[PDB]
């Protein structure tokens, strides 16, 4: 058995409607369930038996389909609905086992646009002695996505950058982002100006510090 | 009623590991197919197998290298052998209800109860406690009304670390970002918090039995 969910990522404005699809490689009648998972939490049952709502789930969630094609329709989407959705089918017996999750569909909930405030943090004084130094830059409460660029004395950096993005805010649909630049102690004393540029379309914000001060 | 998984640990390639799923506020009975489910970091859900609480059923990729058992009316186990990096994941236990077919088969109706999950990390590295560094605006700047401070939690293994501020009393304005795995296999994360007028980040790393408190102040 194979559960194919297409597409892997969907988006809709707050209040709008989205449909997540799940296709089955065989005929599975009606024994399909839907699940919601937010980062760091176990999955939560939304629907089972194709369309039966679970205890406590709003009617804005709607099961559908039969046989080979099923769908989950979310009407009146809110920022709290931003998450990943999985279909699931399972059959067991003494000779044949057919179990499978779908690959999952991520929902990005489009909310009100917000430009990011940016912060740079020079390394604490006790980092340099360790041979390695880490510079953190943060982009706070924004939507839609941003891109981050690192400049050390006007030279764009391309190695040693890790970026990490929070899930969408439950009430606000906004993101937060950290961007970390790691260098060797020698590399860091070798240069002076360290700058972090966050770009959200046509707008951009830049923060900087200079090692000496 | 609730479920709690235990046993997740850092282990070397080739090792075996047993995880346990303990029930609270109910017992494993003849209406329960207890399933194990796992999720590799940033990937999708993958069914492992299930045991009838009143005989076992494994996925094709699992049958032959792991075992599910029922020890008591409160506990079931997952015994995994020859672990590899592809087994690094969160392992959940879920209580399943089935709809019988009448011909000797059963269809999974739903998983209505999930434990919070336990983390299995398969790597050759040793456990390593994080280094904690204060995040503060550069000293050569004029301080302002408000200020955002934080802690960098760097170079630890295995996950997770937990981060509180002022022992849990400080929550509004806190952003703790998702851990990122670096080239070296170690993890890192940061936590920032916004305030006006010091503050203390509390970092717990259970797997090294470590707790670190760093008091952060803006540097002038």
Numbering used by the authors:
A (entry chain L): 2 to 95, 95A, 95B, 95C, 95D, 96 to 210
B (entry chain H): 2 to 35, 35A, 36 to 54, 56 to 82, 82A, 82B, 83 to 100, 100A, ...
Question: What did the original publication write about this model?
Answer:
The HIV-1 surface-exposed functional Env spike is the sole virally encoded target for broadly neutralizing antibodies (bNAbs). Most cross-conserved sites on the Env spike are occluded by host-derived N-glycans that appear as “self” and sterically limit naive B cell recognition of the underlying polypeptide surface. Functional gaps in the contiguous glycan shield are the protein surfaces of the receptor CD4 binding site (CD4bs) and conserved residues proximal to the furin cleavage site at the Env interface. From the Δglycan-primed rabbit displaying the broadest and most potent neutralizing responses, we isolated two vaccine-elicited bNAbs (vax-bNabs), E70 and 1C2, directed to two distinct sites of Env vulnerability.
The other isolated vax-bNAb, 1C2, is directed to the gp120:gp41 interface and is a very broad mAb elicited by repeated vaccination with the liposome-presented cleavage-independent trimers. The high-resolution crystal structure of 1C2 Fab was used as a starting model. Analysis against a 40-virus panel revealed moderate potency but greater breadth than E70, with 85% of the viruses neutralized. Further analysis revealed that 1C2 bound to gp140 but not gp120. To pinpoint 1C2 binding specificity, we performed nsEM using 1C2 Fab in complex with the 16055 NFL TD CC+ trimer, which indicated the gp120:gp41 interface as the target. As observed for both JRFL and BG505 viruses, greater apparent neutralization activity was detected at 24 h compared to 1 or 6 h for 1C2, 3BC176, and 3BC315, whereas the activity remained relatively unchanged for PGV04 and T20 (fusion inhibitor). Together, these data implicate 1C2 as having a similar Env destabilizing activity as 3BC315 and 3BC176. In sum, the vaccine-elicited rabbit bNAb 1C2 shares many similarities with the infection-elicited human bNAbs 3BC315/3BC176 but achieves greater neutralization breadth.
